[PDB]
């Protein structure tokens, strides 16, 4: 938990609580349950993220007009990592100059792990600037939003020959796809290793030129995300339902008995992984004592999950004993096997009931989380997802926030929590002086929890 300032992502990364936990108690006490290995994948809701480049020139007279570099200058930037010292619309130059000379791009040390930036004049007048940064696009990938907040109505996978299976909504005269385009590895290096990219797309914005490398959708995007694998899974069969339970899990899954076609295109990016995961669980756990029963069956859970199932059946007790080491003896072993199977089915039924016992508790705790998320959404979401998550309350939704790590040694806590500007009012949490990385302007925020630094309106209260 480093000292950090967490800011909300412009209102874009919204999340909300919904009563999506449904409990259906299985009625029959039928005890011939199947055993097997299970892997569960969830529908991928997260947005596809890809790198883009943003080319701009900066005119200052502090008005700081941003303008699009000409496309030939864009080619100069991409091929030589150099930019020309002039811009024309009638003509302007660097301060007190007329050279129209070439300039070598150098790193802007003020730039971060997002929006890594390169400038020709390090003056942190006319400047030339190239930002390399992220962009996100949610399914259907018909538009993407870059980290700088610009929205582009073009599919990140439109390759100039598939507008029937993609989207293009920006101005046609300002869009250019380039086969086998050569771009340098690092704009900040005087000499860098050039790299060819199959299809590179450019779009001339009003104040910018945005470029991105077009890739194959089915090859870069996967609509299913692996959630979890259960090695000891039991399954109860109804007339039109399979009910999956796991002893280590507090969640049970329910699906119809009709299976999903495993040779479907939507499973192409998860099929081999899931199959090998099942095979690994068999090899490391059941290769000796069990045997595979049937093939891999794919089911779609009522809640939308995708289940890959491998049934397993334990070897007969004669084989188990031989690995650990006449008709009447065959009858004795048959009676032993019958007794073992009966009691094992009893155990499996009990385990299934125990697994079902968690649902009401989980539903009530979900309502508890929803109520508590209005007071501290970040703590509640961090508890739910088991990772540091910052969130803000936005009425009926929560906004996810992203945290910028600060100097970590500039954090000075003020000694006086009394609001000098207003007698009778006191700060709720102590005020902090801090500095951003590679920066010197002292900032005033308020100390939060888990080393978080708060900004905006300071929390105040009565001086009790």
């Amino acid at each position, epitope marked *: 938990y480093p000292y950090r300032v967490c800011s909300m992502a412009q209102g874009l990364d919204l999340i909300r609580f919904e009563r999506n936990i449904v409990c259906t108690s299985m009625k029959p006490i039928n005890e011939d349950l199947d055993e097997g290995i299970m892997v569960v994948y969830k529908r991928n809701i997260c947005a596809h993220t890809f790198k883009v480049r943003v080319y701009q020139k900066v005119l200052t007279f502090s008005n700081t007009e941003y303008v699009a570099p000409p496309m030939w200058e864009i080619h100069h930037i991409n091929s030589h990592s150099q930019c020309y010292s002039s811009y024309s619309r009638f003509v302007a130059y660097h301060r007190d100059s007329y050279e129209n000379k070439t300039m070598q791009l150098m790193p802007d040390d003020y730039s971060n792990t997002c929006s890594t930036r390169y400038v020709t004049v390090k003056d942190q007048n006319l400047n030339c600037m190239v930002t390399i940064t992220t962009a996100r696009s949610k399914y259907p990938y018909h538009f993407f939003i870059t980290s700088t907040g610009d929205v582009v109505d073009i599919s990140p996978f439109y390759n100039g020959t598939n507008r029937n299976a993609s989207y293009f909504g920006e101005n046609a005269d300002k869009f250019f796809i380039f086969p086998n385009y050569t771009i340098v590895s690092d704009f900040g290096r005087p000499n860098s290793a050039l790299e060819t990219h199959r299809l590179v797309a450019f779009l001339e914005r009003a104040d910018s030129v945005i470029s991105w490398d077009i890739q194959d959708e089915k090859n870069v995007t996967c*609509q299913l995300t692996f959630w979890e694998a259960s090695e000891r899974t039991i399954r109860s*069969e*109804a*007339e039109d339902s399979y009910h999956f339970s796991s002893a280590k899990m507090t969640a049970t899954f329910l699906s119809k008995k009709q*299976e*999903v*076609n495993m040779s*479907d295109s939507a*499973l192409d990016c998860v099929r081999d992984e899931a199959i090998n995961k099942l095979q690994q669980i068999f090899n490391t756990s059941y290769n000796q004592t069990y045997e595979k029963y049937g093939n891999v069956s794919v089911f*779609e859970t009522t809640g939308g999950l995708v289940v890959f199932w491998q049934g397993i059946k334990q070897k007969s007790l004669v084989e188990l004993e031989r690995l650990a080491n006449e008709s009447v003896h065959n009858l004795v072993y048959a009676q032993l096997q019958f007794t073992y199977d009966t009691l094992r089915g009893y155990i499996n039924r009990a385990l299934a009931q125990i697994a079902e016992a968690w649902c009401v508790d989980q539903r009530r705790t979900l309502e508890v989380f929803k109520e508590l998320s209005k007071i501290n959404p970040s703590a509640i979401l961090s508890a739910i997802y088991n990772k540091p998550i910052a969130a803000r309350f936005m009425g009926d939704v929560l906004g996810l926030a992203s945290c910028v790590t600060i100097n970590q040694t500039s954090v000075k806590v003020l000694r006086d929590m009394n609001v000098k500007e207003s007698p009778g009012r006191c700060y709720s949490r102590p005020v902090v002086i801090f500095n951003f990385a590679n920066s010197s302007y002292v900032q005033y925020g308020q100390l939060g929890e888990d080393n978080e630094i708060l900004l905006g309106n300071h929390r105040t209260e009565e001086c009790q």
Partner: antibody
Amino acid sequence: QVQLVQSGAEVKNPGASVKVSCKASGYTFTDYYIHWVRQAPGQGLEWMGWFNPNSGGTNFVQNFQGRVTMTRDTSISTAYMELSRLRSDDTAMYYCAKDSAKTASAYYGLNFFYYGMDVWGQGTTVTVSS
Amino acid sequence: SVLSQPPSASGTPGQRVTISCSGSSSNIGKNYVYWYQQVPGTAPKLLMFKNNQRPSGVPDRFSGSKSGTSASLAISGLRSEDEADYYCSAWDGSLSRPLFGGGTKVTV
């Protein structure tokens, strides 16, 4: 209404092939599995197999697995079952039926399962004689 | 595996007649039982889907019931149009196949 129409009476010779057609109406042809059932004259129903109009998938009993060819035409919304190597015992009434099982879900394609043949075709009489 | 049902049944208008269907641990044991009518010279018609649910256009005379690995169709009032062949069908998971019964001929 949901309806299935089947070809008329056909007479062949042992060793020929019969292409029975099944036209769908009132519902999307490729959204439901098709069952093919047979009944001999004065005998009960015999389930020949199932066909997937959405993907061309087909499964038949061993008595018909190597002798049945399945084709489709989504534009006509008509399935075709071609039975080759006709024998004297192949003369019977053939029915095509619609299952309540769908050929695909909202996201993935679905495998065959039996949920009842709610809609049946008119039937086709196939006679085999020397 | 097969489905066993009586070859024929008989009765009088207004009477009740019952058709029984027997399965195994698979099929009827773990799956629904679908009942199809068939008037002689006509195509089969679904009377009962799932265990006891019934489509539109089927009279209330036909009541379906399920118990263990067995099913029954009760015809009450046994009218002159109820004489026909009745088939029970079930999904056998061991064979992964729809199984039909032998057929029961109600003659009234």
